[PDB]
From TrEMBL, chain B:
<keyword id="KW-0547">Nucleotide-binding</keyword>
<feature type="binding site">
    <location>
        <position position="50"/>
    </location>
    <ligand>
        <name>ADP 1</name>
    </ligand>
</feature>
<feature type="binding site">
    <location>
        <position position="188"/>
    </location>
    <ligand>
        <name>Mg(2+) 2</name>
    </ligand>
</feature>
<feature type="binding site">
    <location>
        <position position="112"/>
    </location>
    <ligand>
        <name>ADP 2</name>
    </ligand>
</feature>
<feature type="binding site">
    <location>
        <position position="50"/>
    </location>
    <ligand>
        <name>ATP</name>
    </ligand>
</feature>
<feature type="binding site">
    <location>
        <position position="188"/>
    </location>
    <ligand>
        <name>Mg(2+) 1</name>
    </ligand>
</feature>
<keyword id="KW-0479">Metal-binding</keyword>
<feature type="binding site">
    <location>
        <position position="168"/>
    </location>
    <ligand>
        <name>Mg(2+) 1</name>
    </ligand>
</feature>
<feature type="binding site">
    <location>
        <position position="173"/>
    </location>
    <ligand>
        <name>Mg(2+) 2</name>
    </ligand>
</feature>
<feature type="domain" description="Protein kinase">
    <location>
        <begin position="22"/>
        <end position="338"/>
    </location>
</feature>
<feature type="binding site">
    <location>
        <position position="30"/>
    </location>
    <ligand>
        <name>ADP 1</name>
    </ligand>
</feature>
<feature type="binding site">
    <location>
        <position position="114"/>
    </location>
    <ligand>
        <name>ADP 1</name>
    </ligand>
</feature>
<dbReference type="GO" id="GO:0046872">
    <property type="term" value="F:metal ion binding"/>
</dbReference>
<feature type="binding site">
    <location>
        <position position="307"/>
    </location>
    <ligand>
        <name>Mg(2+) 3</name>
    </ligand>
</feature>
<dbReference type="GO" id="GO:0005524">
    <property type="term" value="F:ATP binding"/>
</dbReference>
<feature type="binding site">
    <location>
        <position position="31"/>
    </location>
    <ligand>
        <name>ADP 2</name>
    </ligand>
</feature>
<protein>
    <recommendedName>
        <fullName>Protein kinase domain-containing protein</fullName>
    </recommendedName>
</protein>
Amino acid sequence: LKARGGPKTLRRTPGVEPKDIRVLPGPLGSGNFGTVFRGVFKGDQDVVLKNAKADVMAAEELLECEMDVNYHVHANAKGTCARFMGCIELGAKDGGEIYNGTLTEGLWLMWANEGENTVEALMRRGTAPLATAMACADATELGVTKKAMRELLGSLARLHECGVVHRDVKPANLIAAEKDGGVLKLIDLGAAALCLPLPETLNYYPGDGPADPRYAKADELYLLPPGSPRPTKDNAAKLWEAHKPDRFDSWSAGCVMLQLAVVGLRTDAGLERFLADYKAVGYDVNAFRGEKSGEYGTMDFAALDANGGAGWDLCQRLMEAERDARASCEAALSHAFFDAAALEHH
Amino acid sequence: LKARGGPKTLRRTPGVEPKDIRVLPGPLGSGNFGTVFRGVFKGDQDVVLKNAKADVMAAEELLECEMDVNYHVHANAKGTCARFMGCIELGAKDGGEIYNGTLTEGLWLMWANEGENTVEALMRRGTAPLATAMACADATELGVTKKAMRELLGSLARLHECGVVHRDVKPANLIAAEKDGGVLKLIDLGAAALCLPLPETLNYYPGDGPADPRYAKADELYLLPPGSPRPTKDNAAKLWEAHKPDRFDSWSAGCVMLQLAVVGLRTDAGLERFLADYKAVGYDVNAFRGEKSGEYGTMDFAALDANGGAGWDLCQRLMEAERDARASCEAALSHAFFDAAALEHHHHHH
Ligand SMILES: Nc1ncnc2c1ncn2[C@@H]1O[C@H](COP(=O)(O)OP(=O)(O)NP(=O)(O)O)[C@@H](O)[C@H]1O
Ligand SMILES: Nc1ncnc2c1ncn2[C@@H]1O[C@H](COP(=O)(O)OP(=O)(O)NP(=O)(O)O)[C@@H](O)[C@H]1O
Ligand SMILES: [Mg+2]
Ligand SMILES: [Mg+2]
Ligand SMILES: [Mg+2]
């Protein structure tokens, strides 16, 4: 007597069939657990596709969580991130080959291709191509920083409002979306947490988690401190207020601001140098300006100095050593840095 | 008063200067914590170059450990792995651009390019191309399995002998080295542990470390089990005997053998299907043959069946459910699977 076989259950999005998708060879990148490819959907829609790495422990489960968070964001924070177009799951015999333009076995996620750039790529080419991609009329460090940060903080505020902490905020995960007026959109919710029970928290736990060492505060690589109780539907709100996991994104946003504002900080080594000095002076911006900035003769901090040092003050708020002192992204959005020019004389 | 500052310090290998290295754009591969590129050294030496991923926590520390282990292996187990040519560290102003063909800021490792094809790539094209690249005269599944497993198990035995567990054994990390008669060499010591105090253990810790879930036993994703005194210079030798972390490599080598031996098992899907059934029948090879083999009518187990089922038995030894029952790579080497047949080659022998 043999065990019977049975159907395979596959996840699918209404309107999206495997036949509809052509994948383009050559990954745009590989992250911790997955690989991203360019694709064409229904003949003329430019999309991007992500699958799980076969060689990485738990990769499918990590992608499943990214999928869940993407659905949450699609429902609650439209426009903050790349437009989510759903999923497609394929079986063994029904899978093809990447180098032949067909989706291979396993779960795939799909988004609109929001643009061929990232802010990291653009800023490293220069403030000018960055401002052009952003449709930013004030093509200066100050101009791009004001526009970019208003957009990033606005989006982070909306994410946090619906319980999502992105946890991988950085220029490489921002695209200037030319089809939507150049507005910045976040990508990559692969490390994101849902910190409210809707119906349950996702990817949210005590202790250290995935982080980009350049953009996460070195002694604060957690959303919940290692001693914290595990989150439950009953304690989530208390934990949100107590441990302020959203302040993880605040620090990262401060790092983004530093790089947009100061050309010399756009390289990894540049920002790394600044942060080491910043830590050395006790996470005190005024201390850095007084004791350290003289050492940065090759750089220009004009965007941060402008208007009573408003840029520096906003960085200080986003980058306080203590979470309890660090500004929320929502609060930061109301900072003087973002004030409209008075008496413009049009 | 003003702080004086001072010079930068960069790590370098005698005889290897960044001006002599041209990097070719286009990552050969993206691993967990690093990126590999082809390069040309001194205008005519084909090399491979690896740096850390900027976006991965402690990728820096992992590349340093990979460096340390490569030095250990170069000193103690020459020929087992891709030839290690040392490191090159570049600073900020002297750092270049991959698109301009120059090494970027940070630490780089360099190895000889041992060949353009991995065993994974070859075996998937066919036993024929694989046998050719291996200089394997017996161009059958049995032939290539015998030659390849002899080489692999030999190298693993040597690595274990100097305290190194590779921890990422699979066809993708084997290259048939054209410039050394086609012999297999391991690549990628990025997950490797040095498990003895020589003078200090490296990348050796209790609990689940990194692992390719295809080539690691699903419930044995560790070298040392969460339950065991952290590795120290004093207990190292004891843990080795108690927890047998090298048996991690034994299981992986059994997986390689299965794939070399059975064409149908060369796809992820194929090997996955087998290991699931194998697991289902209690990690019992004979049970598999008895209860399941009939369901594999599309596959041909001849290489494992040959000579009283020697191949199947070696697979059983390498792939015992319990580490205490699982063969070491050294023990696996003397198995009957590797015996010359009676009067083998008699027709041309002098
Ligand atoms: N919606 C999108 N539109 C355009 N490009 C995208 C989109 N999503 C991702 N990309 C690009 O694909 C690559 C990786 O995307 P991401 O979602 O960050 O996954 P990843 O695993 O982190 N890959 P990588 O950035 O190379 O480490 C980057 O080049 C992104 O710019
Ligand atoms: N010494 C070598 N000679 C030739 N090819 C090599 C060598 N080392 C690595 N490669 C190739 O580079 C790619 C990755 O190398 P590896 O050392 O495994 O680092 P990795 O970060 O794990 N990249 P990958 O294994 O592809 O995910 C593989 O395609 C190998 O074929
Ligand atoms: Mg990313
Ligand atoms: Mg770096
Ligand atoms: Mg590898």
